[PDB]
Structure formats: structure tokens, C-alpha cells
């Protein structure tokens, strides 16, 4: 199999977030950026398939500012094979989302001939828990979303679910579309040689305007603001007096 | 202006989030037409009848539906919307559809919106991003307006005072590219988690699996659901149906107890809009202080049980 690894660039997790004053989006400049967790998990998963030789190649893909090369960078030094930066000017960049995404996906998946793309479940910074749906979509492919396990046997894939109630086994007949949950692995750590050997394999660097993608969007945000914030709260030394507390106020 | 609604629904018992996403609906001051696909669904489609606001109900039985797989539900919605050109599809923000919704919106190549927590204008809504940390108001000027609607920021509509017209569905070929194999859910007695009116939720404070029984004893008194942190499913304590957070589900009971969680950005996330919160922790820096309307710096294991005993 070839498999097709989508990796995207978000705040840091751990970062506590700023809305710009001008309500136009929140701080990222001089912030930290990493890779998405989930991405992360999507790469981890791909990089075992090879290691069971189950996978022949792996590719990491990325789109967005020239900034977004580091996390290629990171998925290169985690064992994706190669790299491709669907590079958007930052301005442009700003109004990227999951259907523009999803389309450049789409095209690279028929142009590299994959026969498995790779996805997080949602990105922590738009939470849209779009692209992976709509790439298969647009692909016509089976799609297996919010995947805790993932196996391969022969020309199918077998994938067990996080569901509301519990977990989900289903059989997808490839190509196939499967985006990552939290419980799939624990994404390893790449070492230095790694990450050395990483700035040796290269990345192609495509415009999505060569893959024949339109990135005109008919969603506009209009703000960003912060959300109301709650009126901070009280101490009890016993829990009596806790309990004592919510009587008086009608939630007990 | 016409809403379609995908009911969510599984044993002649339709989904309560289905319930919230009507009222949203009729926000948008259109006629309101369901859609109800599986392999049965003839109880359902009479309860849906019932339930105020809805006009029309679609009736999609079939075998093929079995296990509500996007690929065969897909055709079917594209087919009813070139019947009945709605401008608006939405569905419940659940893992069915967060799984579904995109994918018809593909199909419709048009862009969707997730999660909406208010309806500005039947094209301005508003969402949350950054594990809800940032509120943002879109303007959507897609032909057709696919989202997904957040439950627990709309009221259920009544079960009662509709009148619609149930109506077989534009039925298609299957396309069987996928297959539902098998399940395992969670059995429980405790009231889901989502729809909770109490909520009490453990993380990695509670040491161990059997620990949790404190919880379960405690949530009885309060006839509330349990929840869970990350560390709490990792560590094997419960299952991850049991998360709340970014990743897990979002609640807003009107009484959520935090005990033995610290309070991180991605359990926020998924627990900051309850009415009233509650924090037992041992350290008086845990971030969960900082938005418990009450909270006591105290041992878990000290704390936890008194509580039960006063509310004996
Ligand atoms: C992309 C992403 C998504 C995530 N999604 C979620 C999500 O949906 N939900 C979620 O919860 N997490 C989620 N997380 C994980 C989150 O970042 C934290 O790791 C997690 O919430 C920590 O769980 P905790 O508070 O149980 O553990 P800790 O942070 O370790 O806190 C344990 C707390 O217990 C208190 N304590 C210990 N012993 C006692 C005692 N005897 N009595 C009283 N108090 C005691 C400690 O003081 C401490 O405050 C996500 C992370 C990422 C990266
Ligand atoms: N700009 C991007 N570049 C690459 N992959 C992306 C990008 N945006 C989203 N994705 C992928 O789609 C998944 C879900 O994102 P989202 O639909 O935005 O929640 C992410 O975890 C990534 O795998």
C-alpha cells in the first residue's frame, strides 16, 4: 500500500489562547505551534503499518504558510518516506478550511495513487471534524472516522470505533479513508538522528492552484471574541457546608 | 426556506439530541421536514409525527441501513434533496453526525459548519473553536446550509402538539463499499451522560478502577450520570464513551462535580458551560478552582464519602 498522511499545524495544545482585540482571530504570532495530536496519532499509525510491512510508503502532506514545513519535518523524522507542502500564502492561509483541504487531498490521493489517506479526527484549533468525511466524499471512498484500531487483512481494512455509547467494528473495502482518535497509539518521540536525517528527505512544494483546487470560500467570519466569562466562586471548609451550600440554591 | 432534519435513532427509541436540533431548526423560521432511515424505523417516524414543529416526515426502511453507514445514507439525502430542494440539512452534533454531515456536504460541494451553539440569521451562526475557547460568528453564503447542531445549547422540543405527514422515501441502489460488522457498547443503568441533569466526574485522583465505586455510590444519591477525564480512560479506570471534554462529550448539567481532575484546557472544554460547578481536589492550584462556583481543597477519599452519608 501507499498511504497518504494529512498533518496539520495548530497552536500548541498546552498554550492558553488570546482573541486579537481587533476580534479578527486570536494571537499566533510569537506563539507556540506544533503538530495537531491527532495528526500525530494519524502519522504513528501509518509508520507501524510500514513496520508490520503491511505499508510500502508513507507520505506526509501539509497545507498552508511556509511555516507549516517543520511539522512535514516531523512526520519525515517520526518515518513518513517523503513530504509534500501544498504552500498558501499566510493572508490566504487564514481563510483555509476543511472543504478546500479536503479538495487538495482528494486530488493528491488520485495523482500518488493511494490506496489509504490517514487523517486526525478534528484539528484542536478550527474543531471542525470535517476534512476526513468530506475527503472521502469528494474521493468516493469508504471512510472510517474516529478510529481506535485499525486493521489491514488483504484488500480490506477492518476498523473498530469510538462511538457514543461504546465502540463499532466495521469492514471498508480500499482505498479507504480512516481519520485517528486519541486511543488508536501513543505517537512515538523522533530522536535526533531522526530529526537529522529528516532535513535529507525532501519536500515537494505544489500551489493548490496546480492541483486545479479553487480555494474560494462562501463562509466568512464575521468575529472572534471571548467567550462570557463566569463570575468566580467560593471556598467551603466542610462538606457540610458544601452540601449546605447547594441546598440553599436549588441544586440539591 | 426548508430545513431537513436527520433523525438519529437505534432500537424504536429516537436519540434525544434529535429533539434539540428540531428546536434549532425552527429557529430558522422555515417549514421543518424529517428524515428517518434505518432498518426500522415505523415507531420512530410516529413518535417524530407527534413532536411539535415538524411537518413532514420521510421514511427510509431498509435493510441496507444497517448500522447507518455514511455511504449508503449519503445517496439517499442527496436523492431527498433533489426532490425537495431544502436550504437548510442539519443533525444533532453526535458522533453520527459529525460522521454523516460532512460527507453529504462533499457531495453538495459546499462548506459546512460544526458544532453551532446560536442562530443569528437563517445564514449567521455562531461556533466554538480553540476547545471552546474563542466564540466565532460565521456568515455562510452556501446555497444549501449543512451543520450540526451543539444539544445541549437548545431546548428539546415537545414529544407532543405536532402534525406531519409520514411519507415513503426516495430509495436507493446500495452502494456496499462498506459493512457493519459488530458493536460493544457500554451497559449501563446510570442516565446518559449528555442529558444528565447531574453529572459527576473522576480523573487521575481516584487512583484505580475499583476506586470509582466511591463515584458510582455518590452519583446514585444525586441520580447522576458519571464522567471522565483523559487520565481516567487511559489508565483503564473506565471506558471512553465515559470522557467528557474536546475529544469526549459535551455537557451542561446544572450541577457538575469534578473530583480528583485538575482542570486542563480539553476537560474544560466539554463541562464549562454547567450551571453551577463543584471542585474536590487536594490542590488549591489545580486550574478547575478557577471556575468552581464552589470548591473544597481537600482528600477525595475523605471528601467523596461524607457527601454520600449527608445525602443519606
Ligand atoms: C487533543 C487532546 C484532547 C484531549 N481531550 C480531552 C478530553 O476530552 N477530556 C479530558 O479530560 N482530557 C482530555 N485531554 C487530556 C488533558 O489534556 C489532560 O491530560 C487531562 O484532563 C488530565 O486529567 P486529570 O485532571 O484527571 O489528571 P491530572 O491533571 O493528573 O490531575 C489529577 C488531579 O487529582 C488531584 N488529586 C489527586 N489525589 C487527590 C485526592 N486524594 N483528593 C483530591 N484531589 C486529588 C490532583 O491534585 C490533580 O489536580 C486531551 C488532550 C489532548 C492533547
Ligand atoms: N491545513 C491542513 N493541512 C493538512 N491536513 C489538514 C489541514 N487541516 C486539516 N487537516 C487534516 O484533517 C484533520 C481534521 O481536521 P478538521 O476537519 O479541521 O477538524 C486534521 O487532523 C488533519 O489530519
Redesign the pocket.
Known sequence: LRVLVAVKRVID?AVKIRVKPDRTGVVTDGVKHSMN??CEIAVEEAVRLKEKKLVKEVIAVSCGPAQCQETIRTALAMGADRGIHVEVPPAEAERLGPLQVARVLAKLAEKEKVDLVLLGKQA?DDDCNQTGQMTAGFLDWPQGTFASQVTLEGDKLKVEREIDGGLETLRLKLPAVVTAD?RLNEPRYATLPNIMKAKKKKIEVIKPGDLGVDLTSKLSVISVEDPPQRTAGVKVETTEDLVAKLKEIGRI | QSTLVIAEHANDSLAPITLNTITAATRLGGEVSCLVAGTKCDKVAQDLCKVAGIAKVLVAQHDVYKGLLPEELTPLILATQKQFNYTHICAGASAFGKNLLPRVAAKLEVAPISDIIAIKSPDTFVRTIYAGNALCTVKCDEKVKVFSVRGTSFDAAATSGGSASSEKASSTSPVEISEWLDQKLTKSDRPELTGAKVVVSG???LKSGENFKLLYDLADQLHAAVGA????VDAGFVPNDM??????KIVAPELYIAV???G?I??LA?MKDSKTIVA????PE?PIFQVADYGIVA???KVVPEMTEILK
Do not use: E
Open positions: 495544545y495530536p491527532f484542536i486519541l | 480523573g487521575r485522583g477525564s483523559r487520565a481516567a470522557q467528557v471534554g474536546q475529544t469526549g480528583g481532575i485538575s486542563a480539553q476537560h466539554g474536590i481536589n487536594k490542590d489545580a482528600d477525595l477519599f
